Nucleic acid binder design. Structure first.
Ligand SMILES: [Ca+2]
Ligand SMILES: [Ca+2]
Length: 258
DNA sequence: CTGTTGCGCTTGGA
DNA sequence: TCCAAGCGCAACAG
C-alpha cells in the first residue's frame, strides 16, 4: 500500500473508532498537517508510515563567509536546534559545500534531530501522531523519541513539477515527433494508442513527463531548481514498551473527550 | 497567466 | 535489506 492509501486508512480508523470528527486535508498539500480533529479543542494529527521522512529546510552555501545561510524563502522559522545543525555543517564547510544527490550524513547526536522535529510539528499545532505496526499507534508529540529512530542528511532535492501550459504546448509537440510517437491533442489532453506512461521527453530547455489518468494522458513540466536541504528520516522502533503505549492512548482519548 | 521555490510524500533499484 | 533520489502540490513574485 502506498502512502496515500495509508493516510486514508488512518482517517477511516479514527472516524469508526472515535466518531466522524476527523477531517483529512490534501495529500501533497505542503501548508498544513494531515488530519484535523474538528472537536471542541481542535488540533492536528500527523500520519506517518513506519519508514518516512520528517521535514526539512533549505540551506544555501555562502562561499564568501564559508558558512551556510538559512534560505529566506523557507517556511519554518529558526529554532535553537536548527542553528546547532547549521553551526556543525559550517565548521565542516569544505565537505558539505559540495552538494550531492546521494547526500552527506550529519553525524550529530540523535537528541538534536528529535528536538527539531518536536519544535517543527508543534509549530503546525500537531499534538498527536498516528502510525501502524500492524495495529494503529497513536502517541503525543511529547513522546516522539520513544517510537522513532531519527536520521538526518543534507542533499539536493529537485523541486516539483507543474502542469503543461498553453505557452509550452508548441514545444512539447516538437519533441514528440522527434521521438516518433503518433498522437492527437484535444486542448491540453493527450491521446495515443501507444503507451507512453512515465515517458520522459526533453528539448528546448523544458523537460516533460507524461502521466496516465482518467483513461487519457496528462503532461507535466519538470523543474529546474536543484537546491539542497537538510532532511530528516524516521523508522519505527520494532519493540515498543506496552507501558508507554497504553498511557499515550489514554492521553489521546482524554484529549478528544475534552 | 508563467516560472521559481520549499515542503509533502517514501519509493525504487541494487 | 540498504542506499540513492525526485515528482505532486501551494505560495510567491513577476
Ligand atoms: Ca501531509
Ligand atoms: Ca504525514
Amino acid at each position: 500500500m502506498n502512502w496515500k492509501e495509508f493516510e486514508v486508512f488512518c482517517v477511516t480508523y479514527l472516524n469508526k473508532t472515535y466518531g466522524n470528527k476527523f477531517a483529512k486535508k490534501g495529500e501533497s498539500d505542503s501548508t498544513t498537517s494531515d488530519i484535523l480533529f474538528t472537536g471542541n479543542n481542535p488540533f492536528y494529527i500527523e500520519a506517518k508510515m513506519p519508514h518516512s521522512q520528517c521535514g526539512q529546510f533549505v540551506l544555501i552555501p555562502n562561499r564568501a563567509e564559508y558558512k551556510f545561510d538559512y534560505s529566506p524563502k523557507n517556511k519554518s522559522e529558526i529554532n535553537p536546534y536548527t542553528q546547532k545543525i547549521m553551526q556543525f555543517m559550517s565548521e565542516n564547510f569544505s565537505e558539505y559545500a559540495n552538494l550531492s544527490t546521494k547526500g552527506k550524513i550529519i553525524p550529530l547526536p540523535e537528541s538534536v534531530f528529535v528536538n527539531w522535529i518536536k519544535e517543527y510539528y508543534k509549530s503546525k499545532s500537531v499534538k498527536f501522531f498516528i502510525t501502524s505496526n500492524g495495529d494503529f499507534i497513536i502517541f503525543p508529540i511529547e513522546h516522539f523519541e520513544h517510537y522513532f529512530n531519527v536520521s538526518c542528511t543534507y542533499r539536493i532535492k529537485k523541486s516539483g513539477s507543474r502542469h503543461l501550459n498553453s505557452k509550452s504546448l508548441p514545444d512539447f509537440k516538437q519533441a514528440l515527433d522527434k521521438k516518433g510517437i503518433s498522437y492527437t491533442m484535444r486542448g491540453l489532453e493527450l491521446h495515443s494508442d501507444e503507451n507512453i506512461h512515465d515517458k520522459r521527453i526533453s528539448g528546448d530547455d523544458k523537460d516533460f513527463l507524461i502521466k496516465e489518468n482518467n483513461g487519457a494522458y496528462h503532461v507535466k513540466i519538470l523543474s529546474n531548481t536543484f537546491n539542497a536541504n537538510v532532511i530528516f528520516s524516521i523508522s519505527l522502533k520494532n519493540n515498543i514498551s506496552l507501558f508507554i503505549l497504553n498511557e499515550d492512548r489514554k492521553a489521546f482519548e482524554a484529549a478528544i473527550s475534552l
